[PDB]
Design an enzyme around this catalytic site. Structure first.
Site, PDB file in Angstrom:
ATOM      1  N   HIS A 287      70.805  26.448  88.729  1.00  0.00           N
ATOM      2  CA  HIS A 287      70.311  25.334  88.080  1.00  0.00           C
ATOM      3  C   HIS A 287      68.964  25.755  87.204  1.00  0.00           C
ATOM      4  O   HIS A 287      68.621  25.715  86.254  1.00  0.00           O
ATOM      5  CB  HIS A 287      69.930  24.063  88.682  1.00  0.00           C
ATOM      6  CG  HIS A 287      68.789  23.189  88.168  1.00  0.00           C
ATOM      7  ND1 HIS A 287      69.023  22.037  87.173  1.00  0.00           N
ATOM      8  CD2 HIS A 287      67.742  23.141  88.373  1.00  0.00           C
ATOM      9  CE1 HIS A 287      68.038  21.649  86.827  1.00  0.00           C
ATOM     10  NE2 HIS A 287      66.918  22.301  87.700  1.00  0.00           N
TER      11      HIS A 287
ATOM     12  N   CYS B 187      73.227  21.966  82.712  1.00  0.00           N
ATOM     13  CA  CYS B 187      73.966  23.294  83.338  1.00  0.00           C
ATOM     14  C   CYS B 187      75.248  22.491  84.241  1.00  0.00           C
ATOM     15  O   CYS B 187      75.548  21.424  84.474  1.00  0.00           O
ATOM     16  CB  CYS B 187      72.915  24.037  84.367  1.00  0.00           C
ATOM     17  SG  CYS B 187      72.711  23.047  85.942  1.00  0.00           S
TER      18      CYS B 187
ATOM     19  N   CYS C 197      69.416  17.873  82.575  1.00  0.00           N
ATOM     20  CA  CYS C 197      69.797  19.201  82.408  1.00  0.00           C
ATOM     21  C   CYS C 197      71.357  19.102  82.183  1.00  0.00           C
ATOM     22  O   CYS C 197      72.126  18.405  82.560  1.00  0.00           O
ATOM     23  CB  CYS C 197      69.673  19.992  83.913  1.00  0.00           C
ATOM     24  SG  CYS C 197      70.322  21.563  83.966  1.00  0.00           S
TER      25      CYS C 197
ATOM     26  N   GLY D 275      55.746  50.887  85.983  1.00  0.00           N
ATOM     27  CA  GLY D 275      54.457  50.879  85.806  1.00  0.00           C
ATOM     28  C   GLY D 275      53.892  49.704  86.881  1.00  0.00           C
ATOM     29  O   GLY D 275      52.809  49.638  87.385  1.00  0.00           O
ATOM     30  N   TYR D 276      54.884  48.728  87.283  1.00  0.00           N
ATOM     31  CA  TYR D 276      54.465  47.448  88.193  1.00  0.00           C
ATOM     32  C   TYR D 276      54.482  48.136  89.607  1.00  0.00           C
ATOM     33  O   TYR D 276      53.675  47.888  90.492  1.00  0.00           O
ATOM     34  CB  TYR D 276      55.341  46.372  87.919  1.00  0.00           C
ATOM     35  CG  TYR D 276      54.809  45.183  88.762  1.00  0.00           C
ATOM     36  CD1 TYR D 276      53.741  44.320  88.354  1.00  0.00           C
ATOM     37  CD2 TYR D 276      55.407  45.064  90.103  1.00  0.00           C
ATOM     38  CE1 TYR D 276      53.430  43.351  89.315  1.00  0.00           C
ATOM     39  CE2 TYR D 276      54.995  44.015  90.582  1.00  0.00           C
ATOM     40  CZ  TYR D 276      54.045  43.174  90.104  1.00  0.00           C
ATOM     41  OH  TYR D 276      53.452  42.059  90.916  1.00  0.00           O
TER      42      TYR D 276
ATOM     43  N   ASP E  47      62.306  47.682  82.647  1.00  0.00           N
ATOM     44  CA  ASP E  47      60.837  47.881  82.937  1.00  0.00           C
ATOM     45  C   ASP E  47      60.541  49.547  83.088  1.00  0.00           C
ATOM     46  O   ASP E  47      61.584  50.174  83.245  1.00  0.00           O
ATOM     47  CB  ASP E  47      60.228  47.376  84.113  1.00  0.00           C
ATOM     48  CG  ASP E  47      58.775  46.899  84.032  1.00  0.00           C
ATOM     49  OD1 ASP E  47      58.164  47.399  82.980  1.00  0.00           O
ATOM     50  OD2 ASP E  47      58.210  46.237  85.027  1.00  0.00           O
ATOM     51  N   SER E  48      59.337  49.957  83.071  1.00  0.00           N
ATOM     52  CA  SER E  48      59.173  51.419  83.226  1.00  0.00           C
ATOM     53  C   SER E  48      58.731  52.037  84.658  1.00  0.00           C
ATOM     54  O   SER E  48      58.784  53.060  84.922  1.00  0.00           O
ATOM     55  CB  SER E  48      57.995  51.717  82.454  1.00  0.00           C
ATOM     56  OG  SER E  48      56.768  50.931  82.847  1.00  0.00           O
TER      57      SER E  48
ATOM     58  N   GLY F 184      49.336  43.579  82.917  1.00  0.00           N
ATOM     59  CA  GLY F 184      48.461  43.343  83.677  1.00  0.00           C
ATOM     60  C   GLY F 184      48.036  41.950  84.018  1.00  0.00           C
ATOM     61  O   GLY F 184      46.832  41.497  84.546  1.00  0.00           O
TER      62      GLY F 184
ATOM     63  N   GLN G 252      46.809  46.921  78.658  1.00  0.00           N
ATOM     64  CA  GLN G 252      46.246  46.800  79.748  1.00  0.00           C
ATOM     65  C   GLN G 252      44.744  46.317  79.423  1.00  0.00           C
ATOM     66  O   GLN G 252      44.352  46.003  78.402  1.00  0.00           O
ATOM     67  CB  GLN G 252      46.351  47.831  80.701  1.00  0.00           C
ATOM     68  CG  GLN G 252      47.748  48.160  81.080  1.00  0.00           C
ATOM     69  CD  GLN G 252      48.452  47.195  82.179  1.00  0.00           C
ATOM     70  OE1 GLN G 252      47.466  46.269  82.651  1.00  0.00           O
ATOM     71  NE2 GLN G 252      49.926  47.210  82.349  1.00  0.00           N
TER      72      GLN G 252
ATOM     73  N   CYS H 209      74.320  20.517  87.579  1.00  0.00           N
ATOM     74  CA  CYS H 209      73.877  19.339  87.307  1.00  0.00           C
ATOM     75  C   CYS H 209      75.038  18.497  87.029  1.00  0.00           C
ATOM     76  O   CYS H 209      74.721  17.203  87.075  1.00  0.00           O
ATOM     77  CB  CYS H 209      72.892  19.248  86.507  1.00  0.00           C
ATOM     78  SG  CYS H 209      71.155  19.668  87.028  1.00  0.00           S
TER      79      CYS H 209
ATOM     80  N   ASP I  50      59.265  36.958  81.138  1.00  0.00           N
ATOM     81  CA  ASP I  50      60.273  37.271  82.367  1.00  0.00           C
ATOM     82  C   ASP I  50      59.623  36.989  83.711  1.00  0.00           C
ATOM     83  O   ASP I  50      58.396  37.167  83.574  1.00  0.00           O
ATOM     84  CB  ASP I  50      60.623  38.907  82.111  1.00  0.00           C
ATOM     85  CG  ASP I  50      59.749  39.573  83.096  1.00  0.00           C
ATOM     86  OD1 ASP I  50      58.705  40.096  82.510  1.00  0.00           O
ATOM     87  OD2 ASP I  50      59.725  40.096  84.192  1.00  0.00           O
TER      88      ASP I  50
HETATM   89  C1  LIG Z   1      54.753  38.787  88.379  1.00  0.00           C
HETATM   90  N1  LIG Z   1      53.813  39.480  87.574  1.00  0.00           N
HETATM   91  C2  LIG Z   1      53.746  40.502  86.797  1.00  0.00           C
HETATM   92  N2  LIG Z   1      55.034  41.445  86.753  1.00  0.00           N
HETATM   93  C3  LIG Z   1      54.874  42.267  85.915  1.00  0.00           C
HETATM   94  C4  LIG Z   1      55.447  43.517  85.540  1.00  0.00           C
HETATM   95  C5  LIG Z   1      56.728  43.981  85.957  1.00  0.00           C
HETATM   96  C6  LIG Z   1      57.855  43.013  85.517  1.00  0.00           C
HETATM   97  C7  LIG Z   1      59.186  43.161  86.191  1.00  0.00           C
HETATM   98  O1  LIG Z   1      59.215  42.461  87.431  1.00  0.00           O
HETATM   99  C8  LIG Z   1      60.114  42.660  88.504  1.00  0.00           C
HETATM  100  O2  LIG Z   1      59.990  43.848  88.881  1.00  0.00           O
HETATM  101  C9  LIG Z   1      58.797  44.156  89.438  1.00  0.00           C
HETATM  102  C10 LIG Z   1      61.574  42.462  87.874  1.00  0.00           C
HETATM  103  O3  LIG Z   1      62.486  42.884  88.896  1.00  0.00           O
HETATM  104  C11 LIG Z   1      63.123  41.949  89.693  1.00  0.00           C
HETATM  105  C12 LIG Z   1      61.730  43.099  86.546  1.00  0.00           C
HETATM  106  O4  LIG Z   1      62.884  42.369  85.983  1.00  0.00           O
HETATM  107  C13 LIG Z   1      64.082  43.147  86.103  1.00  0.00           C
HETATM  108  C14 LIG Z   1      60.505  42.900  85.526  1.00  0.00           C
HETATM  109  O5  LIG Z   1      60.605  43.817  84.623  1.00  0.00           O
HETATM  110  C15 LIG Z   1      60.792  43.293  83.243  1.00  0.00           C
HETATM  111  C16 LIG Z   1      54.836  44.552  84.638  1.00  0.00           C
HETATM  112  N3  LIG Z   1      55.448  45.550  84.414  1.00  0.00           N
HETATM  113  C17 LIG Z   1      54.726  46.847  83.893  1.00  0.00           C
HETATM  114  N4  LIG Z   1      55.357  48.022  83.437  1.00  0.00           N
HETATM  115  N5  LIG Z   1      53.567  46.529  83.489  1.00  0.00           N
HETATM  116  C18 LIG Z   1      52.652  45.494  83.867  1.00  0.00           C
HETATM  117  O6  LIG Z   1      51.526  45.418  83.540  1.00  0.00           O
HETATM  118  C19 LIG Z   1      53.338  44.386  84.430  1.00  0.00           C
HETATM  119  C20 LIG Z   1      52.723  43.173  84.741  1.00  0.00           C
HETATM  120  C21 LIG Z   1      53.306  42.057  85.466  1.00  0.00           C
HETATM  121  N6  LIG Z   1      52.967  41.001  86.013  1.00  0.00           N
HETATM  122 ZN   LIG Z   2      70.905  21.921  86.237  1.00  0.00          ZN
END
Ligand SMILES: CNc1nc2c(CC[C@H]3O[C@H](OC)[C@H](OC)[C@@H](OC)[C@@H]3OC)c3nc(N)[nH]c(=O)c3cc2[nH]1
Ligand SMILES: [Zn+2]
Ligand SMILES: CNc1nc2c(CC[C@H]3O[C@H](OC)[C@H](OC)[C@@H](OC)[C@@H]3OC)c3nc(N)[nH]c(=O)c3cc2[nH]1
Ligand SMILES: [Zn+2]
Lengths: 364, 367
Positions: A327, A298, A296, A83-84, A80-81, A208, A181, A301, A258
């Site tokens: 699991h 896994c 399952c 942005g969250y 991820d970048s 978003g 977004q 299980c 994810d």
């Molecule tokens: C829950 N709802 C949710 N999560 C959004 C994530 C974060 C994903 C991120 O969510 C965790 O980080 C915080 C995870 O870390 C434990 C990351 O995996 C490594 C995962 O990155 C792919 C978003 N990321 C960006 N950059 N932009 C988004 O608009 C966006 C929307 C999300 N909605």
């Molecule tokens: Zn299982």
């Protein structure tokens, strides 16, 4: 031999697609669930960039050989970048058009995120799929706030493109995703999609969402938002989600998912089954000799009964939550496989109907 | 060069003692808190622990042995203590068949079956490469009738003798490790005396106070420690299993305990609770959203030099697992800092004053 990034669609049904993303480090079967990677079956794992930025640091990750050697994982890795965290940690940020600076630490240390620095960090992590530095607009948001946020993200998306392209090694071996977004508003979603397609990206994420809007509102936004993206490119729904969220999103054209629920649920005593999630701490499981799920495949299980896991957790043995988590992670991959199989067969619409009927009847 | 196991007492105050346990793999400063070890200096521990029952099931004692024992498994060349399974005999009793021979667990879905006994438990702890071995006992459930506590303690005492012989039957273990006996008897004084006498007749390098921290409450636990600790050999280490809260530790040291273990530092750090000199704080409280101070103003741990309460509060609110990791890392380090201040105060002859000051500040809760 293998291409940098080639997405192929092998079968379709309604809006649902199944296919492959081919990269230098392996093939990604879609629709895909991408689990969170950790330090040392899925096709690709993820790195929490903001987390790694602070511990142990992107440069240290780079010096020890990147995330592939850090996680003992030679297959693709997506990052991820930030942005969250721009949103979820906004109270600790100073935000402007240049980027996002976090509150200084007690040791003088200071971290900042921008389209340029975010691509630099993701490069240092050695990630194969790079996400544009965006802002996950908070929910709810006014059309005014959603618009300014989305428009800023789109300018950030262009800077992320240039920063990605400015590094020859990254541009030739990794791939870049743009993030749509616009909150729940159709006109803003259309603006973001058009802006992303004008710039050009290997894949397109629907950002978003999964921020508290609810599945009905989320499905409603996906109904008009996913067809705004390029049809011949992968569609990544960030943060989603529950198994029924995944199935309905696949029905609306999502190829990549994810979320942290498999580990978050397993640590809170919740196991995903084909008959819906179960709370293993419930007394009904105290003598239940069945595995978490009767179908399952896994490792958990094949060895562990509900009764044993229920008592492990009641007894404070952390191994119980580890088995639940293991699991849940495997169940998620089994769900994605059955999805891919059903699309390939032309029976996905029937699978989704059968999945929902059994998942919601809760005859566990 | 170093002895197998030598406990030395360097200073005393009331029933409290400070000193050293010397072993082939290093020195253990007492009173000691012994944190749970995982798979691989003022906050540093001298010895870490292995969950034998857990390791027995994952990845297996034999597999741990083939990869070089727990010292290479946890990347730790200093002493390691292992429990015997006697706590899981109770905490997982609904999954067990128990008899005089030992404890057999419910067969798995793959046919696999695990059993624990005084002989097999010492065998597993040996395979783990443990430096301090605990007798296979039974942590008697609480509450317990005087009758049930009696049969339980007496069975454990027969198991303790079998644990002694099984430990002594292996030359490499007997010459390089140490064996602790575990006192039972629930909250009953006469049974505690029977258990102590029985353990001292057998002979052990150290003596653990078992069967406490099982829901009785600090007042009842202290009352039992009041008469139970002086029943043990004075020149041997006293290990209070499962304890505990910082105020539990201080009061237990007041009553002669030299060794502690508990999962609260990690359990609290995962539940948004940080230990401070002004008492525990719930980092999730909104008061901390802009609190620029570290978790604790005196703590020397790595977290407290870098991370503010405000930053950790928002990490946890934002679902960033790193927040619970920092809370946990601070709690573990604070625990070693508490033990050091305890050891320092006994050495100075000021432990009674420290305990009064500690309690006054810990419970005022002026964080
Ligand atoms: C829950 N709802 C949710 N999560 C959004 C994530 C974060 C994903 C991120 O969510 C965790 O980080 C915080 C995870 O870390 C434990 C990351 O995996 C490594 C995962 O990155 C792919 C978003 N990321 C960006 N950059 N932009 C988004 O608009 C966006 C929307 C999300 N909605
Ligand atoms: Zn299982
Ligand atoms: C909470 N009150 C508490 N815990 C007692 C443990 C277990 C300690 C054990 O507690 C966790 O296991 C379960 C820890 O694993 C996470 C072990 O550390 C690795 C630790 O072993 C030293 C006791 N163990 C035995 N053998 N006998 C006891 O009488 C006894 C009493 C306890 N009270
Ligand atoms: Zn600290």
């Amino acid at each position: 031999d293998r291409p940098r990034f080639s997405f192929s669609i092998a079968a379709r049904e309604g809006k649902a697609r199944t296919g492959t993303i081919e990269m230098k480090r392996g093939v990604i079967r879609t629709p895909a669930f991408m689990p969170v990677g950790t330090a040392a079956g899925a096709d690709i794992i993820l790195g929490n960039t903001y987390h790694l930025m602070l511990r142990p640091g992107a440069e240290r990750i780079a010096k020890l050989g990147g995330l592939h050697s850090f996680m003992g994982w030679d297959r693709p890795i997506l990052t991820d970048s930030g942005g969250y965290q721009v949103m979820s940690l906004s109270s600790l940020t100073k935000q402007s058009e240049e980027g996002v600076t976090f509150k200084s630490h007690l040791d003088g240390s200071r971290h900042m995120l921008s389209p340029e620095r975010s691509i630099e960090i993701q490069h240092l992590l050695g990630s194969d799929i790079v996400m544009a530095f965006d802002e996950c607009t908070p929910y709810p948001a006014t059309p005014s706030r959603a618009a300014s946020s989305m428009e800023r993200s789109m300018r950030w998306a262009k800077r992320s493109r240039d920063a990605f392209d400015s590094r020859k090694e990254q541009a030739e071996n990794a791939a870049l995703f743009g993030i749509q977004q616009g909150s729940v508003f159709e006109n803003l979603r259309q603006q973001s999609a058009d802006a992303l397609a004008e710039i050009g990206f290997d894949g397109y994420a629907v950002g978003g969402l999964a921020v508290g809007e609810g599945q009905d509102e989320m499905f409603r936004v996906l109904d008009f938002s996913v067809p705004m993206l390029p049809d011949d490119k992968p569609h990544y729904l960030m943060g989603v989600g529950k198994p029924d969220d995944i199935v309905g999103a696949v029905e609306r054209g999502i190829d990549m998912f994810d979320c942290v629920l498999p580990t978050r649920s397993g640590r809170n005593g919740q196991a995903f089954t084909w008959d819906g999630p179960i709370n293993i701490r419930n007394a009904r499981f105290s003598e239940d000799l069945k595995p978490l799920d009767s179908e399952c495949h896994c490792a958990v299980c094949q060895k562990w009964s509900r009764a044993y896991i229920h008592h492990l957790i009641r007894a404070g043995e952390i191994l119980g939550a580890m088995l639940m988590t293991e699991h849940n992670i495997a169940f998620y991959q089994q769900l994605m496989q059955k999805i891919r199989d059903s699309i390939s067969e032309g029976r996905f619409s029937q699978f989704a109907q059968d999945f929902r009927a059994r998942y919601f009847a809760r005859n566990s």
